[PDB]
């Protein structure tokens, strides 16, 4: 028999932690409405009263209001939703003291969850901003149009970066195979001033185009080996785990 525990401002607000194998004691005092609040998005199925007429019931979504309406209101409520089955022991109090106005069901499992992913997200963001333990290549040569010339180009072994000054237009970046044909690669833009365009590969030969001006970039320190990406992310500090289960 779980006893609701009151808040430290008033005794009329009480909290109770759920239990599948225990019923809830509610001492209903005369003349008050009691608010029972379900889980967010709890789907209502059915109730059951020890006396339909000793108590007045009204529901909206996950909200319940109960009120004494007959003498000697001492019965039980078994309200069942999709997820569980609440059990309330409705005992009417005689001296109309010690009312409850809302009852709360904190679920320790759900609170434990909510705490977890917040800490996890903080850790993930911290790990990403750590960005330590990498090598950087700068053996890059360029040929052709220099008016689309990036100011710096490099690679961290997984991504290739180009940097353009403030006054130039950001061109399109193209991937060259060994044969000489071009093709598409996904690109993303990063930086304080969006002046770095990053592509998702390291390749010996890059081609840059803008209208009818074409520029070629040679990666002259190509690493066929590269660093394998076991962690499943852009940084070796974070894994990628399967939530979906099944």
């Amino acid at each position: 028999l779980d006893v609701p525990s009151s808040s430290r401002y008033d005794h009329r607000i009480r909290y109770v932690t759920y239990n599948p194998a225990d019923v809830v004691q509610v001492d209903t005092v005369l003349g008050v409405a009691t608010h029972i609040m379900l889980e967010e998005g709890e789907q209502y199925l059915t109730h059951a009263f020890g006396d339909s007429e000793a108590y007045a019931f009204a529901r909206k979504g996950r909200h319940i209001f109960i009120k004494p309406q007959a003498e000697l209101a001492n019965t039980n409520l078994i309200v069942v939703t999709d997820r569980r089955s609440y059990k309330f022991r409705l005992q009417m109090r005689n001296d109309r003291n010690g009312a409850m106005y809302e009852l709360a069901f904190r679920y320790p499992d759900t609170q434990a969850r909510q705490t977890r992913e917040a800490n996890a997200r903080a850790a993930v963001e911290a790990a990403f901003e750590q960005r330590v333990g990498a090598y950087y290549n700068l053996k890059y040569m360029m040929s052709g149009d220099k008016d689309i010339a990036p100011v710096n180009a490099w690679d961290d072994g997984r991504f290739t970066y180009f940097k353009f000054s403030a006054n130039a237009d950001l061109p399109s970046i193209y991937f060259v195979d060994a044969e000489g044909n071009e093709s598409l690669v996904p690109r993303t833009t990063v930086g304080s001033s969006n002046n770095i365009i990053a592509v998702h590969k390291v390749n010996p030969k890059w081609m840059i185009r803008l209208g009818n001006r074409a520029l070629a970039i040679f990666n002259e320190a190509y690493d066929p080996n590269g660093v394998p990406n076991d962690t499943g992310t852009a940084s070796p500090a974070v894994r990628r785990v399967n939530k979906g289960g099944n």
């Binding site: 007045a56 009120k67 237009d169 950001l170 061109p171 399109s172 993303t188 833009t189 990063v190 969006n194």
Partner: protein
């Protein structure tokens, strides 16, 4: 819980007047954070384009597109724009009309514009 004549029809109708309604001037909400019709987005095309089958396009902006007041950067350079066409061509036509459904920014701003695509100098298609 809860308590509760008209003859000469030809010159008649050619004299039928044509009335154009009035107009009133409005004002814009906040110029620092709006982009008005007719403002120029200058993106460089990524995908090569062939009109034999209906497909989609893709282009990246090349300039910070400032606000109508010219004070706030509302679309960062390198933003990414998706657009499509259809229907192919008809004889003699040497241009195709392409429509850009959605832009997407580096920082995650997504605003849904439906604007025509133009050549380097604004001509249709």
């Amino acid at each position: 819980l809860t308590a509760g004549g008209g003859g000469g029809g030809e010159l008649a109708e050619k004299l039928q007047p044509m009335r154009l309604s009035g107009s009133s001037a409005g004002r814009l909400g906040n110029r620092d954070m709006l982009i008005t019709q007719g403002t120029q987005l200058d993106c460089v095309l990524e995908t090569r384009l062939v009109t034999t089958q209906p497909g989609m396009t893709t282009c990246h902006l090349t300039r910070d597109v400032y606000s109508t007041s010219g004070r706030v950067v509302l679309l960062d350079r390198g933003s990414k724009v998706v657009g499509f066409y259809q229907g192919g061509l008809r004889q003699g036509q040497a241009r195709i009309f392409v429509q850009w459904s959605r832009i997407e920014t580096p920082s995650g701003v997504v605003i849904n514009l439906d604007s025509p695509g133009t050549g380097p100098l604004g001509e249709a298609g």
